[PDB]
Structures are given as structure tokens and as C-alpha cells.
């Protein structure tokens, strides 16, 4: 019953083509609910969930102002890190930022996150005690000193356990029929004959929510985890997810394989067979 609120910020510098492209995305659980694209004509924080469109124009005025401020901070950080790393001024570089919080079933604060990344690699992260930083290289040690002399982990503390935990319960309350639901998987098994002596059994799990699922293609108890495609949970597009797990069972040997599905929307794990 644990819930989380995440914010993803991606700033990609485009030298010779304008200002760094900035995209901000927010997610109550696995449900995007806000949005900001710097290339869009609106130039506002936009709602992407039906339960967030009820917030007053003061909420959207503030969200736009606070996301257009991170837009500028990332815009000067791209040129700052480009000098820390001594890189050319005509290359595209990315600054990804991901922060947020995790509350429990009772709405109490569990942990808070704040992680930056420069060019896909980790740059700096906020330690689990929420007062220390982990600088991932020799150019994030300079940032670490700034963020320690400026007490950045102390100003950010009041947001990660008091402003995320409070608005997150506001979101879980407004979107109660959307975010606090568990759709169990629609599981079925498909046999695809690939040869007269070789076959493949696919174990679908469609339309489930949340995305945390587990398909396990056991064989007489001993789980295999090998010779098994287990594609990443993919968005179905309507708030539900999809995922299948195949096995390459020889022909004439199918009715000894079981597929086991574990989902928090399931009363107990399944044992789909053919």
C-alpha cells in the first residue's frame, strides 16, 4: 500500500539551435499527472491526469513558476558542468534530475529522493539520511562543496518530507478511484508451434496495475529464469500495463510447464498451465 510521487526533469542543451530543451514530468505512482515542455506553445504546467484538473489557477500559476525556475537552473548548469568537464561548446549534453518522496499506507513519510545525472551517468545524489550528498565523480565534488556551503540538503529537507508528503496525500485523495486501485492481470497462455519437435509457451499478463508484476516460468518446481524471454512491462496506453514471459518447451513436452504470476492485485500467485 506504499505510494510515491516522482518528478523527472530532462534538460538537453542544443548549441546553435536555441535554448536547452526542458521537459518536466510528474508521477503519482505510475500515473503521470503534470507536464511541462519548453517547446510547447502553452509555456505552462499542463495537467495529464483527470483528477488534477480540479486544482485552481493558483496551483498552475505556482507550478509553472517553479518549473520555469528549474528550467533556468538547468540552463546555467549545462554551461557550468561543460566547464567542469572541459568539453566543447558545440555538443549536446543532458542533465536529468529525479526527486520525489515515498509515503506509506497510512500516509506517513518513508524516504525522499534527489538524484542528478550529467550525460546519463550519475552526477550527485542525496543520501538516505537526507543531509548528505554522494558525488559520483571528480566534477561533482565541486558541486558537493557548493551544496554543502549553501546548505542545499537542509533547504531541500522541508520539501521532501513536508511538501511532497502533504500534496501526495492530496493527490491520492483526489485520484482515489484512479491511483488507489489494483487491476489484477488478465492472464492467459498461448502455444506457438515453431517446429515439429520445438514449441514456445507465452504467458501473458494484460491490463494490470500497478506495473510491479512477476512472471516465473517454472518446470517441475525448479524455476528456470533461463531460455525465457521476459519482456519489460510495457504500457498498454490506458493506465494499465502488459507483460509476457515465454519458454522454449520442446514439442510433446508442454503439459509439464507452469507459469506463476505474482501481483499485489492478486489474492495469491497463479499457476497457469496448458
Amino acid at each position, epitope marked *: 500500500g506504499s505510494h510515491s510521487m516522482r518528478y523527472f526533469f530532462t534538460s538537453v542543451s542544443r548549441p546553435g539551435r536555441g535554448e536547452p530543451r526542458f521537459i518536466a514530468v510528474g508521477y503519482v505512482d505510475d500515473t503521470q499527472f503534470v507536464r511541462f515542455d519548453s517547446d510547447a506553445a502553452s509555456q505552462r504546467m499542463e495537467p495529464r491526469a483527470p483528477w488534477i484538473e480540479q486544482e485552481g489557477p493558483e496551483y498552475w500559476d505556482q507550478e509553472t513558476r517553479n518549473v520555469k525556475a528549474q528550467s533556468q537552473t538547468d540552463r546555467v548548469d549545462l554551461g557550468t558542468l561543460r566547464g567542469y568537464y572541459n568539453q566543447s561548446e558545440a555538443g549536446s549534453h543532458t542533465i536529468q534530475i529525479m526527486y520525489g518522496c515515498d509515503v506509506g499506507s497510512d500516509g506517513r*513519510f518513508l524516504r525522499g529522493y534527489r538524484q542528478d545525472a550529467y550525460d546519463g551517468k550519475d552526477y550527485i545524489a542525496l543520501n538516505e539520511d537526507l543531509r548528505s550528498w554522494t558525488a559520483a565523480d571528480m566534477a561533482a565534488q565541486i558541486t558537493k562543496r557548493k551544496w554543502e556551503a549553501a546548505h542545499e540538503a537542509e*533547504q531541500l*529537507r*522541508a520539501y521532501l*518530507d*513536508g*511538501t511532497c508528503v*502533504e*500534496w501526495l496525500r*492530496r493527490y491520492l485523495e483526489n485520484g482515489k478511484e484512479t491511483l488507489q486501485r489494483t487491476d489484477p492481470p488478465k492472464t492467459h497462455m498461448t502455444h506457438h508451434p515453431i517446429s515439429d519437435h520445438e514449441a514456445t509457451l507465452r504467458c501473458w499478463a494484460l491490463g494490470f496495475y500497478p506495473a510491479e508484476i512477476t512472471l516465473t516460468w517454472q518446470r517441475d518446481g525448479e524455476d528456470q529464469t533461463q531460455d525465457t524471454e521476459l519482456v519489460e512491462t510495457r504500457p498498454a496506453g490506458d493506465g494499465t500495463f502488459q507483460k509476457w514471459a515465454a519458454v522454449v518447451v520442446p514439442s510433446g513436452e508442454e503439459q509439464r510447464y507452469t507459469c506463476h504470476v505474482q501481483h499485489e492485485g492478486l489474492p495469491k500467485p497463479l499457476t497457469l498451465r496448458w
Partner: antibody
Amino acid sequence: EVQLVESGGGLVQPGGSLRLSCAASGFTFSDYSIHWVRQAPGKGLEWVASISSSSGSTSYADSVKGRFTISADTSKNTAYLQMNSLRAEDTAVYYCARGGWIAAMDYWGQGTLVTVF
Amino acid sequence: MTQSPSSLSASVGDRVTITCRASQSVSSAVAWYQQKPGKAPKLLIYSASSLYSGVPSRFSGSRSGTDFTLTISSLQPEDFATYYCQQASYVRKTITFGQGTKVEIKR
């Protein structure tokens, strides 16, 4: 080191204006918030209004919403509280405090007695 | 909110507990102040459990459900004052102080 001094309130008739000022000294004014808290005579602490020096985010007690406004001259180390349309229920001792990143008012002033007559 | 008791009379040595029934506050925004007569308040416990710098270790703050409690482990003749719990709402942008609890002397 961190010292808050509030001054500027006293006798006032109802339906008039006062400007309480709180000259902060001992910290970077734009790093913390300044809260105005009043202690009605004999009664308990009442939070009145707030200012975030950076981003200029005000907030009021909803009993002083349209009648009190906080301004904060960052390049004076001072937070003001203009109190228009004063009632006889606005008489109290007004403290300015400092929100110190811990969601608590760690440093307080001494008090400005506003008596509406 | 409601702060209980409205006033308790305790003697030097007792363990006193003031409770504040915040039902919608984030523990983080629950602080405990102490005001002596005619003086500015004085922060004791921030984030509902964390002692403030310099406050003696006898003060502690807890949370049993939607109920935040201040405790003075062994009362001393400097703790007789009025204790206020606050609670800030980040959605509504309000700090609300509890009604106050006065600790006094016994016979």
C-alpha cells in the same frame, strides 16, 4: 548572532492602518521565511501572516486575509506588516519569527504591542 | 486541533505529557514551543521528535497515531510554562498553534 527586532505598533483607532517592521540582522534574509505571530492579551499564540523572502510567497491567517499584507524589503533586512482596517480584535503582541528550514520558528523577536482603541 | 490537557499541575520530579491531536499534519511540520510569562516563545521539539539545539534532553516528542505528544521526562523548576504545538499545512499554507497547555505547581 541572529537578532529580530520588531517596532512600529501602538495606539490606533479602529479602521486605520499600522505598519509593523521587523529589522532582521544575523542571517541572509533571502534564505529563510519571516512569520508574524500575535499573542492576544491573555489568549494563546495566533499565527497571523507569513512571507518567503525568495519568491515573495505570502500567506495569511484567513482572519486577516484581506486586511493584512506582508511586504519584505530584501535589501533592507526588514519585513513589514501593513495592517489595514484594524478591529478591536486585532489588539495583541506581535512577534516576528524565522522559519529555519526545519519547519519551525526557531528565532523570535520580543513583541510589538498593538492596542486598537 | 486540540491540545490536552488545557492545564496540568505537576510537581518537581514528575513526568508530564502534553498531547496535541493534529489529524492532518505531516510529523515534520509539528513543532513544540514553550512560552514563559511575558516572553517570546522558545522552540523545543521540531519535526515532532527532534530536539532543538541547546534544549535539555529531558524534553522529547513522540507520535502515537494521529496524536503528537510532548514529554518532560523528569520535571525541573524551569519547565513551568505554557507549551504550544504547531502544525503547518503546505496545501493551505497555514501554521496553526495549539490552544496551549499550562504547567503549574502542586500544593
